[PDB]
Design a protein around this ligand. Structure first.
Ligand code: WKS
Ligand code: WKS
Lengths: 268, 269
């Protein structure tokens, strides 16, 4: 992988592995989300971010700050087959004092055709108190260094899906998968649950018949609170409709919301 | 990746990813086991095996046969760091009518030093009845075409660890992790639980303090029966021992049917 000519974006090629694919021998949406995180990390390292797993700037380290995910939105047109090479291009953008965005474009290396796109929103948080905050003027100046200064959006369309408000699922849910717990493979190098695990947990309450007859087209996931290493999660799903679903992840005990989201599926 | 000059082994290089590493920023043993499976699959494809996820020969497809894992044994000297390149060499051998073996050597691409080694034993099974069987004359002939004919072993030593008998853990276990269930990410393209998931489940009952202060050196895992997509597993561990040694048992949480047994050896960091 490498920064592009202008140094304002990063590209990397990946060969889809045997264990990364589902029953149709194409990459799972979790494999895709893992690849987006990997190219995101390689980009951060190439533009001088910390190498501890937190990907922080020098101002952030001094102020005890870290970025946390607020939302992930992915739209796939074609999932790459086992053995195929997929090229992913990524870049970041400052969104005033609200937070930052990381965008991605996926392409078929052989054809050059766009096969998918993704966007993520990140908010600043104090690492110690776990309190959210606004982006300071010094952090906005650090992002000007490596981000395009004119807008560059993976999802440009006004009023598009990636920015839509997600409602809260009302009990009773149509479908559910209860007592989901993370194991060591679900944790990152800092012992926090990997963001991709929550996508897997959302998908667990989708009936196997939908997965067998449909392809996932779009997934939008809001992140509200973290699942700790010793927490247990319930995954809830209700059909709102193509097939469309509304999702809710909450802690099994007290029912505290951890995530909410929606999925859009197309009949194969 | 590619077959070596003689066409009797296969090599591939891997760059260790951000999500593949643990707290010490080196690859987990599950990442290593995933890489061994991946280079194994690329070798099978290069020597003309099926491309359906079962990796079968022509004779096996005609006879409705598949290979199943009987044992996995891995010894790591150094786990590669995040961003490091690891080169893995793999080859197979026919073991008469008993079954077949796949061996692996891991090396640091920069230094060329051996950082780990692994061996696996596979037994023939009828895909329909799920009954184990011996390897037929025709399957042994298919293996002669791509396997070295003189013995080549990752673990050559006399009565080495890789072939040791593993006893059954007696209740009560010292440690346990109850109610483990596979999710879709744990399944392979054929909707069976991935062999690496069982390594993860064995390790779940090791206390976090051992993981925080020790490095896993050797893991030996026997495979007896499969965990189905709707099964639930309990993971049991008892200390048997500068080094820490454990005995492991995975069983179905309902009836207590054994699915795996194994041992781990750990060294204080
Ligand atoms: C993952 C996450 C956590 C979080 N916090 C954590 C606890 N303090 C307030 C809320 N906020 C967001 C947007 N995402
Ligand atoms: C060695 C072995 C045997 C096996 N059996 C054999 C009896 N019928 C069910 C399948 N399954 C596995 C995963 N490994």
């Amino acid at each position: 992988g490498s920064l592009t000519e202008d140094g304002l974006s990063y590209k990397e090629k990946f060969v889809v592995r045997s264990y990364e694919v589902g029953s149709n021998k194409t990459a799972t949406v979790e494999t895709i989300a893992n690849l987006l995180q990997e190219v995101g990390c390689n980009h951060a390292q190439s533009v001088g971010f910390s190498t501890d797993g937190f990907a922080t700037t020098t101002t952030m380290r001094k102020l005890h700050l870290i970025w946390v995910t607020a939302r992930m939105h992915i739209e796939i047109y074609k999932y790459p087959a086992w053995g195929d090479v997929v090229e992913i291009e990524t870049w970041c953008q400052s969104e005033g004092r609200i937070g930052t965005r990381r965008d991605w474009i996926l392409k078929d290396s052989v054809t050059g055709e766009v096969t998918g796109r993704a966007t993520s929103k990140w908010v600043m948080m104090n690492q110690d108190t776990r309190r959210l905050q606004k982006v300071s003027d010094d952090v906005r100046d650090e992002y000007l260094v490596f981000c395009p200064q004119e807008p560059r959006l993976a999802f440009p369309e006004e009023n598009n899906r990636s920015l839509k408000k997600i409602p809260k699922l009302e009990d009773p849910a149509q479908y559910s998968m209860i007592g989901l717990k993370p194991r060591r493979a679900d944790l990152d190098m800092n012992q926090h649950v990997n963001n991709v695990t929550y996508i897997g947990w959302v998908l667990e309450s989708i009936p196997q018949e939908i997965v067998d007859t449909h392809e996932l087209q779009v997934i939008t996931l809001d992140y509200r609170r973290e699942c700790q290493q010793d927490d247990v999660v319930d995954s809830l799903t209700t059909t709102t409709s193509d097939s469309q679903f509304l999702h809710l992840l909450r802690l099994s005990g007290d029912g505290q919301e951890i995530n909410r989201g929606t999925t859009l599926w197309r009949k194969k």
